[PDB]
Design a protein around this nucleic acid. Structure first.
Lengths: 114, 54, 118, 46
RNA sequence: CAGACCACGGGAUUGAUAGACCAGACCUGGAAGCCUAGUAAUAGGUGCAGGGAACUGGCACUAACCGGCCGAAAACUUAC
RNA sequence: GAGUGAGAAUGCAGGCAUGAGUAGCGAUUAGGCAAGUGAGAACCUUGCCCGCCGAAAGACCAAGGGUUCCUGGGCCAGGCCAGUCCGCCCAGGGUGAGUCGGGACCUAAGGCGAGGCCGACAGGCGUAGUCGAUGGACAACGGGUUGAUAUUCCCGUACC
RNA sequence: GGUGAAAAGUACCCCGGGAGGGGAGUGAAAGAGUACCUGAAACCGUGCGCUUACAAUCCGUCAGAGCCCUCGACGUGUCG
RNA sequence: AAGUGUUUAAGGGCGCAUGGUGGAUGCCUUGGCACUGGGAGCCGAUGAAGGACGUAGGAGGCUGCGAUAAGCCUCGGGG
């Protein structure tokens, strides 16, 4: 098994789907390429995703003593976390529900020999 | 109008998969002796120092 | 120049006129200005027409520029530094450089500068 | 338009129409005060 | 001039693609300044003037980048 | 011995999906640039420019709200986005009157009303009275000051 | 309403502005981290296996090709 | 020379593994419900019931208590 390091960004104030939109971009790529794509991705969800990927890389470097250049985004996924319920008033005094969703973005970077 | 049936999982996901981001095409730029990746669109700006590469 | 094909840049023709005038004033003042790429694209012909008037240094061209710029300091800057500077350059007095988009709306951004290589 | 809502606040009128003195004036209002006191209302009246 | 978001032309300049610039065309209609005539409104000369866009030519002056992604055969049976 | 079996009651509650990353993001003014701050800025600060109202979209009183005011901090909730900002969050501070507006002065409509009259009881009225401003009477104006109060504080000069 | 027996409530270091994590430590257990006993379904992912872009499907049921694992004759892949 | 022929998954389905959300289930409890046996069966102009505002060194709620204000005195219990 490849030496892996984990990083979970929990309760991120972004939808699980909107985090997944960029996690799909940077799943499978090396850590460096993933961070570059998340740097130049126009989606705002790329910033928490980039931060959690970089945290996984930092854990691999410091807590695990792995070579940062050999790291790769092995398994990354955003699960949906808690959802706050808000009320938006609409016409005729009718209250519609608004969902302030969060996401847990889990990242596991492995150190693979190219 | 209003949706008459609940959409099946297969259809919902088939048509939801189309809401995907397109990864930017990154080219190499040498700035401050370092090789960074920037869009070819921002290649000139990065060379001239008009891109914040952090 | 050629008119804006699509909806005017400031949300109206009057606002587009005022916005191009302000952008030209700012460009002639600070050398380079960062603004949304569409504004830079619309300004570059506008600004270069003003610089052409400046190059044709005359009272008539001064009046033609002042009917758009309205800033006497920037008009003097044009007719005393930018016209003489571009006397030898035939067109292409401005340069658009595409830069990163804004964090609040992802608007395409561009820095429009005055050419200086000569 | 005529967008006048039903409730037009007025503290003096609120006190003079639903206040403690008016409630205690009549046995029915005294009954209301007693019923609220038994229910446990913190605000027995306006 | 192709377009809701595609695809078509040009381009990693071995380039007129767009803009600018220079002309032409065309539209307006005689600019500003100065001079002259009128106590003035205003008129006349400078002068087919000035201004300006889409069309047409020139012109690499500005931007088309010292760039990244995709993108090749499993073979077998049967006459000459 | 049963609160003993749910899939239906346009059943009830809680959590979620579908539409959907869709509509919308709330007028009829409009923002731009430079610099700053900051991790982060279309939205905050500053400087210009531009635009909008201007019998107001300016400045006050009243009602109503109740601390939302000022200073310093905060930015995971709210703000239809973000936010370093905010009427949001936290702490502290802030409201100074013989003259202003009220009460201590009057009464109007109306209310309540000692007794009282009427009414099986409950109570309905009501006199004397007593409340009751939206009205009457009633002595102060300029200037300055604070981060936040100002005919209140201060200065000058007035009036019960 | 429910952390834990006991706050012993995670020192210290690292990524991060924080939030949140990763080491480390406490604990019998953080598969107990003040979002906390157990942690169902709905619902939402990620990984793997088969399948699916000539097809008309109350979505199943009966046959059923083709694609992995449990015991052995045999000695090794074709049977049951 | 004609014919035969596996080979893709933008996405989807099924299943398994592994998670998240959520708060069901199980086991509980600080709280209720229904009663049993007793006490007392009234309080108040010596101002009741119930409250408003205050009160502790520090902000608020609940509790207690009233400018003697989480309290004062006397008598008892306990250490």
């Amino acid at each position: 098994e490849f030496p892996s390091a984990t990083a979970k960004a929990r309760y991120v104030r972004v939808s699980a789907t909107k985090a997944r939109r960029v996690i799909d971009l940077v799943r499978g790529k090396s850590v460096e390429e993933a961070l570059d794509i998340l740097r130049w991705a126009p989606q705002a969800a790329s910033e928490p995703v980039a931060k959690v990927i970089a945290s996984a890389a930092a854990n691999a470097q410091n807590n695990e003593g792995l070579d940062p250049s050999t790291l790769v985004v092995a398994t990354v996924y955003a699960d949906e976390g808690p959802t706050a319920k808000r009320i938006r008033p609409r016409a005729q005094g009718r209250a519609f529900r608004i969902r302030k969703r969060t996401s847990h973005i889990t990242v596991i970077v492995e150190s693979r020999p190219p | 109008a209003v949706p008459k049936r609940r959409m099946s999982r297969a259809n919902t996901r088939s048509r939801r998969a189309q809401w995907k981001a397109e990864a930017p095409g990154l080219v190499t730029v040498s700035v401050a002796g370092q090789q960074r990746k920037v869009p070819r669109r921002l290649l000139k700006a990065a060379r001239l120092g008009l891109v914040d590469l952090d | 120049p050629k008119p804006t094909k699509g909806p005017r840049l400031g949300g109206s023709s009057s606002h587009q006129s005022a916005l191009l005038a302000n952008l030209a004033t700012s460009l002639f003042e600070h050398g380079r200005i960062k603004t949304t790429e569409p504004k830079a694209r619309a300004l570059r012909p506008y600004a270069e027409k003003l610089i052409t008037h400046a190059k044709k240094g005359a009272l008539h061209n001064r009046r033609e520029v002042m009917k758009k710029i309205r800033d006497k300091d920037v008009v003097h800057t044009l007719f005393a530094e930018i016209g003489p500077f571009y006397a030898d350059r035939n067109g292409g007095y401005t340069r658009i450089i595409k830069v990163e988009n804004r964090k609040g709306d992802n608007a395409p951004m561009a820095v429009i500068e005055l050419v200086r290589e000569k | 338009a005529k967008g006048k809502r039903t409730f037009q606040p007025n503290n003096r009128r609120r006190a003079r129409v639903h206040g403690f003195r008016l409630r205690m004036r009549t046995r029915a209002g005294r009954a209301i005060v007693a019923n609220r006191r038994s229910k446990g209302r913190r605000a027995l009246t306006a």
